[PDB]
Design a binder for this molecule. Structure first.
Ligand SMILES: [Mg+2]
Ligand SMILES: [Mg+2]
Ligand SMILES: [Mg+2]
Ligand SMILES: [Mg+2]
Ligand SMILES: [Mg+2]
Ligand SMILES: [Mg+2]
Ligand SMILES: [Mg+2]
Ligand SMILES: [Mg+2]
Ligand SMILES: [Mg+2]
Ligand SMILES: [Mg+2]
Ligand SMILES: [Mg+2]
Ligand SMILES: [Mg+2]
Ligand SMILES: [Mg+2]
Ligand SMILES: [Mg+2]
Ligand SMILES: [Mg+2]
Ligand SMILES: [Mg+2]
Ligand SMILES: [Mg+2]
Ligand SMILES: [Mg+2]
Ligand SMILES: [Mg+2]
Lengths: 160, 202, 98, 61, 38, 197, 147
RNA sequence: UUUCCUCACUUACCCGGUG
RNA sequence: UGUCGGCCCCCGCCCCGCCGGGGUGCGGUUCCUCCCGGAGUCGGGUUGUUUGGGAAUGCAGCCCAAAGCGGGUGGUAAACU
RNA sequence: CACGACCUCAGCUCAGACGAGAAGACCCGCUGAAUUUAAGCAUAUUACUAAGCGGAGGAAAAGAAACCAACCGGGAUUCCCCCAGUAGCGGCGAGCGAAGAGGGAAAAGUCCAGCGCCGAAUCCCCGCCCCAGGGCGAGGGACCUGUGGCGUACG
């Protein structure tokens, strides 16, 4: 049977632009579920130094400084047991989503944010909609790197 | 001298060949059906088909009952539609020479059939000579130009349609004549043209 | 004034032909002095087929129409019937010259 | 396992050994060409492999 | 008869001398040597 | 069976098609199988290009693809002799050779000879042994500047032919285009019937 | 999906939307296109006239590459060149005219459907229509051929 | 060189007999 | 579990190097001379089967039975070119 | 066979090897139906399928053009997309149905017989000598009814 469905490449990019545009409004992110009532700015752009992190202690400290640790404390409290016969099929423990992190160079960013529950790391060039718009709802709290923010204007381009 | 032998064996209606084909076909029908010959009756044709004077190369004369195929049905009663009521004018889909080499390569299981050729004709029988090779003789395994037949993939090559006499019945080739067997066999082509290619994004 | 049209007698893109030596496989079936000497020798050793012998019996009575219709029935194609009748007429004329 | 070690030392170097002292790998392997028979290279492809062997080259761009 | 073939196929019994070929294949049919003693 | 205005469908599902159905579930795993084979082959021929030997540039037969050039199979023996390369030596330096293709024109012959000339200039040869370099072997310094060329060897450059804007002459404007084509079709039909006259 | 299906709202209704008098059975009017001349003639002769019979000659070995002849009209003729090129020669009509090679753009024949802008232009095509060249000569320009 | 029919030759072919 | 972490016992692969046993030179030649090919096979008739192949697409039986500037193909049977 | 050679054909629990059966998803060669469809049915369809028979391999088969094309020409085979539900076949009804070109995956090409030069320059067996690789024996054979080297349509 037809398990796979193909979408137009222009509609995949349109859905990606509407998912990134929702990551810049305080309403759509707080209503998505993320607790960002204390973050400094809704588009969270950090220095490129974070791309060189190689230990989780350096990564957990940054999230406590940017007041984004409350979004991860929500992930800990959400870790529970799945309801129904999904526990017998390698889907026993379920949890919530956390702050997505978009980088440009992988100098250790992926492994520094590995062991933190909820963190989803994605390259700026290859953005998956399923992780930037979970469950079809827009407003994923994305933590951007300075390098990823510069290239973001070149991936999709302004209207000019 | 082999040039004068292949051009002499083309005059099968001349007095010289008509006499030899008359005496030998008489002698061939006096022996058994499967009778080993001490040497090729046509040395020019044997060398042409891949025969050498090495040790391990043997020749067997085969007498096959010539004629079509009668469908083996009890009292000629093919229970079905009138399309398949034919019992008499039914022809075998494989050459009659391909039956002689299959009948010789089966009686001699320890040898591999190389080729076969025509040596005698009659109104009742057809006489052939099958060239077999002992793939375990040292004069054959120690020759780089003959080790190809010692491989396990050539086991009973005459009953899979691989010899020259049996490969013709498969109806393969290159061109507008042979579109039926594009892909090897006619069943490989028939299978490909009937598989529903359900792609992943159709 | 005149452009190369895509239709007519001078049809096609204009290119300079590069004529070279023909493929060696195209000489197949050419009579050499040894192939002629071998076949002309066996012709006198073997002889003529029963249908070639009774076809030359029609040429001497000047029945070339019945000869060709007989050879065309034996050999098959009409192209092979003319060459066979010509070969028998050339042999019959050389036999008379002797 | 002592009398077999003595028999293997006894038939060492003999051209014909008992069937139980021969390598029993499998019926297909025992009927394959030995290392001597598969390394035999006829005098034609010996000269062809001598001066027409593929060389080590590289393309700039 | 797929059921009649399933009851007497290769593998429904013991495979005494064939289960050893499966074990000797994963090492390359090694014969003639011995492990390093202590 | 029919109800109202519609097509006359012919779904060829009267055989036992359910026993011959090929599902493309290994399509993405087959890309990994093919890709790892290219990487494994690349390391085996590490100094040599991975795409393969040098392919020629040929023309497509039919008029539908009349103007498109395409990478053929091998270079003609006439194209190798016009560049000094021997028939059997070209197989050793990674040049594809086929004896069936012919050259019916000169424009296609020189297109492959010039393609074959510049290849030998970009072709770096390693000596059979580093102890004694032979004559045809490249120098010792450029051997250090060697690499495995990825992608097709010398890809075909489909140059766009653009004609300069010229002044339309009076002779060029008096050319009856429709009448020339309409007469060319009539002469080709009456050519045989006129030869008998 | 199945939640938007029709069978989800037919649970409880006996005949399942196929009537009680005439029950849903297996092929009550023949399989496929059966009876196209006997009991479905009113359908075939009303919506598919010409379905039965023969017409025309038989072309045994038809190769679609031989009859390949894509056409283009004069209205879309200037689409084969840039918009800036159409204006850079529109201001200077004193003889320099752009050459539009229709063959190198994927087309063979040129047809005179639309209106052509009054600018000198040289066109290269394998085939021209009668009115196609008349509109080019009237506007100004030649119609050269290409094999 | 010939076609039709008939009679003969024995070596093809066929039948019977025998240690 | 993460670390292409550390250690140990077997084994495999390509290239390079010298030593040791067997290999034999190769190309260019609008230069001379010589040689140049697969028969009961192709093909033809007929029969059955097969094919989208249709005055034969393949295969096979019986009969006829080749040629050597020949032979096959060029999707309509046939003759000349 | 008086004494030998040869040809043809036998015997062995003769020296040394080989074949058989299994499995059979995929693969190769034959054989082969009818339910079913045509709202009946006989050609057609089902189908060159199920069942039946033989033979293999990790792949098999195919394969270096007696090809396609009719063009400015392509260049072994296999596979995918497309050609295409198209040309065409068919109580021209139901239905059936390829291929060239083109875009891709992978690409690798070659050996005899014949032609005839080279003192059979060739091969197996047996008895051995040296460190899988090389020699020896006035041993026994195979072979001139033809082994080996050069050489195959690109000359
Ligand atoms: Mg429950
Ligand atoms: Mg040789
Ligand atoms: Mg209805
Ligand atoms: Mg109604
Ligand atoms: Mg109701
Ligand atoms: Mg009811
Ligand atoms: Mg009803
Ligand atoms: Mg009623
Ligand atoms: Mg229905
Ligand atoms: Mg049929
Ligand atoms: Mg078996
Ligand atoms: Mg019915
Ligand atoms: Mg019914
Ligand atoms: Mg079956
Ligand atoms: Mg494989
Ligand atoms: Mg194979
Ligand atoms: Mg091709
Ligand atoms: Mg379409
Ligand atoms: Mg069919």
């Amino acid at each position: 049977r037809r398990w796979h469905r193909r979408v137009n490449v222009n509609q995949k990019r349109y859905a990606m632009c509407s998912a990134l545009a929702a990551s810049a409004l305080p309403s759509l992110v707080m209503a998505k579920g993320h607790r960002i009532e204390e973050i400094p700015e809704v588009p969270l752009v950090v220095d490129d130094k974070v791309e060189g992190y190689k230990k989780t202690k350096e990564a957990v400290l940054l999230l406590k400084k940017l007041k984004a640790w409350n979004d991860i404390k929500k992930v800990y409290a959400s870790q529970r047991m799945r309801a129904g016969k999904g526990k017998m099929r390698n889907r026993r423990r379920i949890q919530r989503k956390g702050p997505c992190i978009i980088y440009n160079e992988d100098n250790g960013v992926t492994r520094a944010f590995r062991n933190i529950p909820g963190i989803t790391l994605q390259s700026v060039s290859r953005l998956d909609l399923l992780k930037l718009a979970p469950g079809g709802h827009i407003g994923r709290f994305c933590i951007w790197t300075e390098g990823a923010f510069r290239k973001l204007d070149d991936l999709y381009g302004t209207w000019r | 001298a082999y040039k004068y032998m292949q051009e002499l064996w083309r005059k099968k209606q001349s007095d010289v060949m008509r006499f030899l084909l008359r005496v030998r076909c008489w002698q061939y029908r006096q022996l058994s059906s499967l009778h080993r010959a001490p040497r090729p009756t046509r040395p020019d044709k044997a060398r042409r088909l891949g025969y050498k004077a090495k040790q391990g190369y043997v020749i067997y004369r085969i007498r096959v009952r010539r004629g079509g195929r009668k469908r083996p049905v009890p009292k000629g009663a093919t229970y079905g539609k009138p399309v398949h009521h034919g019992v008499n004018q039914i022809k075998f889909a494989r050459s009659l020479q391909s039956v002689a080499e299959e009948r010789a390569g089966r009686h001699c299981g320890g040898l591999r059939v190389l080729n076969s050729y025509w040596v005698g004709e009659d109104s009742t029988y057809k006489f052939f000579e099958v060239i077999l090779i002992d793939t375990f003789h040292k004069a054959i395994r120690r020759n780089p130009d003959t080790q190809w037949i010692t491989k396990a993939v050539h086991k009973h090559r005459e009953m899979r349609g691989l010899t020259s006499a049996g490969k013709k019945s498969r109806g393969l080739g290159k061109g507008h004549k042979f579109h039926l067997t594009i892909g090897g066999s006619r069943r490989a082509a028939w299978k490909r043209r009937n598989t529903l290619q359900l792609h992943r994004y159709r | 004034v005149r452009y190369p049209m895509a239709v007519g007698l001078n049809k096609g893109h204009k290119v300079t032909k590069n004529v070279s030596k023909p493929k060696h496989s195209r000489r197949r079936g050419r009579l050499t002095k040894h192939a002629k000497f071998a076949r002309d020798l066996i012709r006198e050793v073997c002889g003529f087929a029963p249908y070639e012998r009774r076809a030359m019996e029609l040429l001497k009575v000047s029945k070339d129409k019945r000869a060709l219709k007989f050879i065309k029935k034996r050999v098959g194609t009409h192209i092979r019937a003319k060459r066979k009748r010509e070969e028998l007429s050339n042999t019959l004329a050389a036999m008379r010259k002797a | 396992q002592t009398q077999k070690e003595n028999l293997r030392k006894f038939y060492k170097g003999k051209k014909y050994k008992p069937l139980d002292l021969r390598p029993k790998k499998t019926r297909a392997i025992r009927r394959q060409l030995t290392k001597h028979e598969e390394n035999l290279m006829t005098k034609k492809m010996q000269r062809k492999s001598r001066l027409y062997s593929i060389r080590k080259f590289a393309v700039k761009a | 008869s797929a059921k009649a073939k399933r009851r007497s196929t290769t593998g429904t019994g013991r495979m005494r001398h064939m289960k050893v070929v499966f074990r000797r294949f994963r090492n390359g049919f090694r014969e003639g040597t011995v492990p390093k003693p202590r | 069976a029919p109800s109202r205005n519609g097509m006359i469908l012919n779904p060829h599902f009267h055989k036992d098609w359910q026993k011959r159905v090929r599902t493309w579930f290994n399509q993405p795993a087959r890309k990994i199988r093919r890709r790892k084979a290219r990487q494994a082959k690349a390391r085996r021929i590490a100094p040599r290009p991975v795409s393969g030997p040098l392919r020629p540039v040929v023309r497509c037969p039919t008029i539908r693809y009349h103007t498109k050039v395409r990478a053929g199979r091998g270079f003609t023996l006439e194209e190798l002799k016009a560049a000094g390369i021997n028939k059997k030596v070209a197989r050793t330096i990674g040049i594809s050779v086929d004896s069936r293709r012919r050259n019916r024109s000169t424009e296609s012959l020189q297109a492959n000879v010039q393609r074959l000339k510049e290849y030998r200039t970009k072709l770096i040869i390693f000596p059979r042994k580093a102890a004694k370099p032979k004559k045809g072997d490249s120098t010792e310094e450029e051997l250090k500047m060697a690499t495995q060329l990825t992608g097709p060897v010398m890809p075909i450059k489909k140059v766009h032919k653009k004609e300069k804007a010229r002044v339309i002459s009076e002779d060029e404007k008096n050319f009856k285009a429709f009448a020339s084509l309409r007469m060319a079709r009539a002469n080709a039909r009456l050519f045989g019937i006129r030869a008998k006259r | 999906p199945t939640k938007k299906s029709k069978t989800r709202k037919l649970r409880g209704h006996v005949s399942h939307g196929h009537g009680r008098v005439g029950k849903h059975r297996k092929h009550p009017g023949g399989r496929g296109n059966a009876g196209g001349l006997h009991h479905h003639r009113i359908n075939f002769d009303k919506y598919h006239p010409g379905y039965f019979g023969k017409v025309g000659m038989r072309h045994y070995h038809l190769k679609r590459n031989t009859t390949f002849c894509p056409t283009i009209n004069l209205d879309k003729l200037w689409t084969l060149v840039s918009e800036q090129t159409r204006v850079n020669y529109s201001q200077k009509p004193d003889g320099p005219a752009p050459i539009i090679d229709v063959v190198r753009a994927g087309y063979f024949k040129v047809l005179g459907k639309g209106k052509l802008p009054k600018q000198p232009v040289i066109v290269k095509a394998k085939f021209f229509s009668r009115r196609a060249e008349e509109k080019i000569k009237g506007v100004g320009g030649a119609c050269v051929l290409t094999a």
